[PDB]
Design a binder for this molecule. Sequence first.
Ligand code: CLA
Ligand code: CLA
Ligand code: CLA
Ligand code: CLA
Ligand SMILES: CC1=C(/C=C/C(C)=C/C=C/C(C)=C/C=C/C=C(C)/C=C/C=C(C)/C=C/C2=C(C)CCCC2(C)C)C(C)(C)CCC1
Ligand code: SF4
Ligand code: SF4
Lengths: 34, 740, 73, 31, 80, 31
Amino acid sequence: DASFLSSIFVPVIGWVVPIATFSFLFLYIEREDV
Amino acid sequence: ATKFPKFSQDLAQDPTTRRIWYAMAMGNDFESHDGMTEENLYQKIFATHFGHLAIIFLWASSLLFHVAWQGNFEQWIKDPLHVRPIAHAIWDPHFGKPAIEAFTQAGANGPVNIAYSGVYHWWYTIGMRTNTELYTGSVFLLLFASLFLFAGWLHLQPKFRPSLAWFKSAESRLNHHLAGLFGVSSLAWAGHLIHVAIPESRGQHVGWDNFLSTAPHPAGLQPFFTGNWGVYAQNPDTAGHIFSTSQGAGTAILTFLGGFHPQTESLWLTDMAHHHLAIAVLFIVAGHMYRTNFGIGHSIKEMMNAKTFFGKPVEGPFNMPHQGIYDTYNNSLHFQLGWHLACLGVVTSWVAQHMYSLPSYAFIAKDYTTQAALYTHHQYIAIFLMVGAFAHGAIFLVRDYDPEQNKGNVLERVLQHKEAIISHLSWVSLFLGFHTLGLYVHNDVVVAFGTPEKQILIEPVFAQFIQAAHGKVLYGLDTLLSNPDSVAYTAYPNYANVWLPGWLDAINSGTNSLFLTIGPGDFLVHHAIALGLHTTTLILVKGALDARGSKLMPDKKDFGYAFPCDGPGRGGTCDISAWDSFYLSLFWALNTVGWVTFYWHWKHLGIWQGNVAQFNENSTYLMGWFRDYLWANSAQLINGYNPYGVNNLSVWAWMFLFGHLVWATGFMFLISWRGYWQELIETLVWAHERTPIANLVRWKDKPVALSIVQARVVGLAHFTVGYVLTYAAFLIASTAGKFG
Amino acid sequence: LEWSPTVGIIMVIANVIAITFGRQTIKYPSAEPALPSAKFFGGFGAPALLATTAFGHILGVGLVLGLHNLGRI
Amino acid sequence: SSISDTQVYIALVVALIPGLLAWRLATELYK
Amino acid sequence: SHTVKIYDTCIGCTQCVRACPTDVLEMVPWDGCKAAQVASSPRTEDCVGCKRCETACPTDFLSIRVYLGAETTRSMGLAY
Amino acid sequence: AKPPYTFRTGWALLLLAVNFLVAAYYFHIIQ
Ligand code: CLA
Ligand code: CLA
Ligand code: CLA
Ligand code: CLA
Ligand SMILES: CC1=C(/C=C/C(C)=C/C=C/C(C)=C/C=C/C=C(C)/C=C/C=C(C)/C=C/C2=C(C)CCCC2(C)C)C(C)(C)CCC1
Ligand code: SF4
Ligand code: SF4
C-alpha cells in the first residue's frame, strides 16, 4: 500500500528538484567567488 | 578563473550569456580544462568511468524495481503470449478521467505504461519467477552501484590515485580483459545458466536457498574430471517440452542441438550454456597472449616494430610499416576512443542483426512491438557509435597526431593519398545514388502509367545463393547445405555436424525471421543501404582526412577541431572544420538508419499478418513505400485522440506531433544563422533599457545570439530528437495498434 | 556421516590450505624446535607446524560438517 | 500482487547509500 | 581578445590596415620585403574578429592570421 | 618500387581466386 509515495515523489521531482537545482545553479553561475 | 566555469579563465571572463552555454559544452572535455596535466587527465577519466558505470547499474536497478513494485510479471509468467507487460505506473494529475480509463490496461489497478523493452522475456528466460527475485536483483544493483561509486571516490585520493605508468600498461589490461572481463564473465554466465536458468526452465526451483544442495546434472563433476564429457549432452529436452514445466524436460546441461526451441521459438538454453562455456575457454586462452610481469608472452610494441620474417627482411607485419602504431594507439586517448566506438558500433549492429533472426529469450519472437523497438533501438545506437568513431578519429588527427613519430608507417601512407580515397568514395556514392534512384523512379513512372510489368526487377541472386548455402530449399539451387550429397552437408571425414538437423529445421520453416525470403524490393533497398553507408563514410572520412588542412585552408590544425569558419574570404568558408563533417554526417546516418528501419519494419509487418505479397509487390516503387507503409500504418496512430475521445495510443499520437515539432524547430537553427538574431536581440536590449518599471531589473550577463557552432549543435540536436521520437511513436503505435 | 576417504582427503586439503596460509603470512614461523627436514616444510618450527595442522583441523571439521549439512558429503 | 511496503521503504533507505556516495564522487570530480 | 599574428611572407601592400574596421593593424618599418614595411597588430584588444584583413591579403595564404580567442565586450562588438 | 609488384598482386590474385571458387560453387561447377 505504498502507492501514496508517488504523490510525494512526482511533485518533488517535478517542482522541488527543479527549483532547488536551478536556484543553486543560477546563484552559482552568477557568483564571483569561484 | 575567479568565477564559473572554473576550468576556463577565458570563458569565466566572458561578459555575455555565451559563457554559460560554452561552459556546459566544454564540461566533459577534460583536456581543454585549465592546468590539466596528462596524469590528472587519466586519473579523472578513471574516476568518471566508475561514476558512469554506477549510473548504468542504478538504471538497471530501476528496471527491476518498477517491474517488481508496479508490473505484472508474476501474472505474465502464466501467459507470456496474451498478457501485456507493464513498464511502471502512471501518476499524472493532468489526466482526465477518460485518459485514466484508457491507460488502466493489462489487468492493472490504475493507469500504467506497457513495457516494450522485452525485460520480461529476458528475466523469465534467465530464471526469474517472482517479484521478490526482481526486488533482490534491484537492491543488489543498488549496493553494486554503491561499490563503484566508492571506488571512483577512492581512486581520487592521494594514496590511491594510479600512476601514469599504470594506465599505459596495455598488455596487462588486454590480458585481464580477455581472461577476466570476457572469459570469466562468460564462464560465470554459463554457470548461472546451468545452475539456475535451465532447472527453472525444467520446472525445478533453484535459488540461493538451495543451489549448494542441488546438483545441475545427476552425475555432478565425476564425468568432468574423468574426461567423459559426453554425459552432459545425453538426454536433451524433447520437442514436446513446455517451458518452466517438467513435461518433456531432459537432464542435459550442454547440448549442441541448433535451431530453436519449438514452443518458445527461441534458442535452447543448453545451447546457450554450451556457447558461453566454449567462448569462455577460448577467451581465457586468448588472455594469455601478451607479456606482463612474468616474462613469457608478446610485446605488442615489438610486434609493431618487427622488421624480419624468419630471417627475411620485411617492412613489418604483412610487409606493412607499423613503427610507432603502438605508441600512436597507446599515447592518444582519442585514437583509442574512436577505435573502441568503431568496434562497439559494429558489435551493436551485429547484436541488432542477430536478435531478430536468432532470438534467445522465451516467447519474444511473438511479441512484435518489442522486436521492432529492440531492432530500431540498437540500430540507432549503432549509427551514433559509428559517427562518434569517425568524429574521434578526426579529433585524434587534429590534436594528438604527429607525423614525426609516425614517420613512414601505414597511417602516414593513408594520409599521403587521401584524395584518392575521398574521390573513390565520392564515385561509389554517386554510382550507387544515381542508379538506385533511377531504378526507383523508372518503376514509379511505369507503375503510374498502368504498366507495372515494365519495372526493372532484379533478383538478389547472390544473397539468395548464400541462403541456399545454409540449407534453404525454397530457392532450389541445390548447393552446399541445401545439397545433401555435398561434402559440407555430410562433413565427410568426421560426420560431426550435430547442429545441422535442428538448423535446417529452423531455416526451412517459414514461420520465423531466420533468413527471410528476399526479392527485388530487398535488392533495391540494399542498394539504398549501401548508398547510405558509403555516403556517410564519405562525409566522415573526408572530414577526418581534411581535418589537419586542405587546399582551401592549409593551417586548419591550428584552429582546432570545432571552429565556425575561416571568414568570408577565398570564396567563403562555411562548414570547413572537421566538426562540420560530424554535423553533416549525422544527417546521413539518421537518414540511413531511417531507411534500414523502414525496411525492417515493413518487411516484418508483412510477415506478421500473413501478407508477404504487400512488401513483395509494392516495395519496388517509392509510392508503394509512401502509401502502404507511411500512410496506411499511421491511421490508428493519429486516431490516438480525436473529437470522439481517447484511447491507449494517445501518448503516441501526442509524441508523434511532439517529434514533428522538435524536428521542425531544428530547421530554424539550421537555416537562420546568427547575425539576424544578434541584430534582433540588440533591439530587445534597447527596449528593456527604455521600458519603465521593467527598468528596475536587468541581466547581469549580456544577451547575445547563440554562436555559429552552437547553432549547428542546437539545430542538429533538435533534428535528431524529433527524428527519434517521431519514428519511435510511429513504430510503437502502428505495431501495438495492429498487434496489441 | 559415515567416515569415507573423501572425509580424509578434505581434511588433508584443509591441512594443506592452512599450512599454505601459515607459510605465507605468519610473522614468526621459525620458532626454537625446528623440523628435521626444513625443506619439505618450507622452514618452520614444530609449534608452527602443528599450529597450521590444528587450524587445518578447524577448517576441515567445519567443511565436512557443513557439506554433510548441505548433502554433498 | 506486488512487493510490500516494507520492501519499498527498505529500498529507499538502501538507495540513500549510493546517493551519499554519488554526492561525494561528484564533489571529488569537481575538486 | 583575439590574436592577430603577422608572418614573414608580407609584401607590405598595406591592404590589411585599410580593411580593418577597428584599427588593429598598422604599418611599421622593415627590410624583408621590397616595400620595406610589415603589418603589425598592437591593438588586438579592439579586434572584433571579422577577418577583413585576411580577405584583403594578396599573398598565397595569408601573411596575416586572426586566431579567435576569448570574448570580451569589444571583441563581441556590443554597444550595450 | 617493384615494377612487377609481386607481393600485392599475389594477395589480389588469391582474393580473386577465392572469388572464383565461390562463383564456381554458385554456378554448380563444383558440387
Ligand atoms: C580481471 C580483472 C579485471 C576486470 C574484471 C576489469 C574490469 C573492467 N575494467 Mg579493468 N583493469 C584491469 C583488470 C580488470 N578490469 C587491470 C589489470 C588494469 C591495469 C592494466 C585495468 C585497468 C583499467 C582501466 C584503466 C579501466 C578499466 C575499466 C574496466 C571496466 C570496463 C568497462 C565495462 O563496464 O566493461 C564491461 C564489459 C563487459 C562486461 C564485456 C564487454 C561487453 C560486450 C562487448 C557485450 C557483449 C557481451 C554480451 C552479448 C552481453 C550480454 C547482454 C545482456 C547482459 C543484456 C571493467 C569493469 C575502465 C573502467 O570503467 O573503469 C572503472 C577503465 O577506465 N580497467
Ligand atoms: C564512449 C563514448 C564517448 C565519449 C567518452 C565521448 C567523449 C567526448 N566527446 Mg564525443 N561523441 C560520441 C561518444 C563519446 N564522446 C558519439 C557517440 C558522438 C557522435 C554523436 C560524439 C561526437 C562528438 C563531437 C562532435 C564532439 C565530441 C566531444 C567530446 C569531448 C567533450 C564532450 C563534451 O564536453 O560534451 C558536452 C556535452 C553536452 C553539451 C551535452 C549535450 C547533450 C546532447 C545534445 C543530448 C541532449 C539532448 C536531450 C537531453 C534529449 C532529450 C530531450 C527530451 C525532450 C526527449 C569528450 C572527450 C567534443 C570535443 O571536445 O572534441 C574535441 C566534440 O566536439 N564528441
Ligand atoms: C539505361 C540507362 C542508364 C542511364 C541513363 C545511366 C546513367 C548514368 N550512368 Mg550508368 N550504367 C547503366 C545504365 C545507365 N546509366 C548500366 C546498364 C551499367 C552497367 C554497365 C552502367 C554503369 C555505369 C558506370 C560504371 C558508371 C555509370 C555512370 C553513369 C552516369 C554518367 C554516365 C556518363 O556517360 O557520363 C559521361 C562519362 C564520363 C563523365 C566519364 C566516363 C565514365 C564511364 C561511365 C565509364 C568509362 C570507363 C571504362 C569503360 C571502364 C569502366 C569501369 C567500370 C566497369 C567500373 C549517369 C548517371 C557513371 C557514374 O555513375 O559515375 C558516378 C559511372 O562511372 N554507369
Ligand atoms: C532528398 C534529399 C537529398 C538528395 C537527393 C541528396 C543527394 C546527394 N547528396 Mg545530400 N544531403 C541532404 C539531402 C539530399 N542529398 C541533406 C539534407 C544533407 C544535410 C545537409 C545532405 C548532405 C550531404 C553531404 C554532406 C554530402 C551529400 C552527398 C550527396 C550526393 C550523394 C551521391 C548520390 O546519391 O549521387 C546521386 C545523386 C542524386 C541521387 C541526386 C541528384 C540526381 C538527379 C535526379 C539528377 C537528374 C537531374 C535532372 C536533370 C532533373 C533536373 C531538372 C533541372 C534541369 C531543372 C548526392 C548529390 C555527398 C556528395 O556530394 O558526394 C559526392 C556529400 O558529400 N549530401
Ligand atoms: C562473413 C563471415 C566471415 C567473415 C567475416 C569478416 C572477415 C568480417 C570483417 C569485418 C570487417 C573487417 C569490419 C570492418 C569494420 C571497420 C570499421 C568499422 C572501421 C572503422 C574505422 C574507423 C572509424 C577509423 C577511424 C580513425 C580515423 C578516421 C582516423 C585515425 C584514427 C582512427 C583509425 C580511429 C567469417 C569468415 C567469419 C565466417 C563466415 C561469415
Ligand atoms: S579581424 Fe577584423 S578587427 Fe581584427 S585585424 Fe582583421 S580586420 Fe582588423
Ligand atoms: S595584406 Fe598581408 S602582405 Fe599586405 S601588408 Fe597586410 S599582412 Fe602584409
